[PDB]
Design a protein around this ligand. Structure first.
Ligand SMILES: CC1=CC(=O)CC(C)(C)[C@@]1(O)/C=C/C(C)=C\C(=O)O
Ligand SMILES: CC1=CC(=O)CC(C)(C)[C@@]1(O)/C=C/C(C)=C\C(=O)O
Lengths: 186, 186
């Protein structure tokens, strides 16, 4: 297989010196295998809030709607455990209506403050979506100011271009990351 | 089959005293006919920028991608004039890909700073979408503050609920208005 090189390109929204400190985290957590039909991207967002505050929000695998747009509801089983392997049924706002993507929790590491999930079933064109989010505290002069890194890999549907698929997924993650800013600042 | 009454309910983001000044504009420009299969909503967004600056952005019928998300490109004909009746072809970012909704300019009023459009062709579920944006300057402690009002009417697709459709359309418009804030305040 072929692998991503997100450590070679500073994403927008981070400085060269901030990024230099995070390259180790990108390699460890934001590297995916790449098939010929896949694309992957890494996004970043600075947040004026303690990383412990941010981690506590994004850790909530059962309540993504608190920090994501376009989710009407999210339910988990009555025996849900916050553990690798638990799943959720996400009801998406799209005008179809109440669509559903079942997602499985892949990583939950409270020591490094990293989580991630993969989409394992649903009615959509984002087949084999996999995402990782890591939380990073910086003593940042009035904050712990946190940079959140979020990357994904996904299949490019036949009849889609890689740029088109990537542009859509990038737009969603960027918009959700802006919402995370609003929620974290309190 | 009656008409909308958005002048009767204050939208979020406005004060009662601010809204009282806008009721005449809501009546004059933000009233739609409503059939039993349609819904309509009215949104507002405060912007710390001169109303003339905001107006110059939202007036650009040929360039919605400057202030809206999820638009890959926008083309108009070689004889395009910025005039009621002109149309544009919008290529939407959706993961389908490069989708298209053809839109017609309905209002372009430079004295009152109102613009509006209706969707006249495309491949989607926002049938008979019609939208109006109006710009409003307020003197606030020596600086101009702009309120943008944006409303729409749209058909509810069979199998959708009104809340679900409204929720989606409300989500899109609000997000486009946040991008408008960034562009105007830069
Ligand atoms: C918003 C939405 C609409 C779709 O059509 C596909 C899917 C259900 C995957 C999705 O939830 C996509 C979500 C994305 C890209 C990222 C995320 O959630 O962090
Ligand atoms: C982004 C998008 C999603 C759709 O499914 C339909 C359509 C393509 C019309 C649309 O452009 C709708 C845009 C909206 C609600 C408002 C606007 O543009 O002012």
């Amino acid at each position: 297989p072929t692998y991503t090189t997100h450590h070679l390109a500073i994403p927008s929204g981070v400085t060269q010196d901030e990024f230099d400190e995070l390259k180790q985290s990108v390699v460890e957590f934001h590297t995916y295998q790449l098939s010929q039909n896949q694309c992957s991207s890494l996004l970043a967002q600075r947040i004026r809030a303690p990383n412990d505050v941010v981690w506590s929000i994004v850790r909530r695998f059962d309540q993504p709607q608190t920090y994501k747009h376009f989710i009407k509801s999210c339910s988990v089983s009555d025996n849900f455990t916050m553990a690798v392997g638990s799943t959720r049924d996400v009801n998406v706002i799209s005008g179809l209506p109440a669509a559903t993507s079942t997602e499985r929790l892949d990583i939950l590491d409270d020591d490094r403050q990293v989580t991630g999930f993969s989409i394992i079933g649903g009615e959509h064109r984002l087949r084999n979506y996999r995402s990782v989010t890591s939380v990073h505290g910086f003593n940042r002069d009035g904050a712990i100011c946190t940079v959140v890194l979020e990357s994904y890999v996904v299949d490019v549907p036949e009849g889609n271009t890689e740029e088109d698929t990537r542009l859509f997924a990038d737009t969603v993650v960027k918009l959700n990351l802006q919402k995370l800013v609003s929620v974290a600042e309190s």
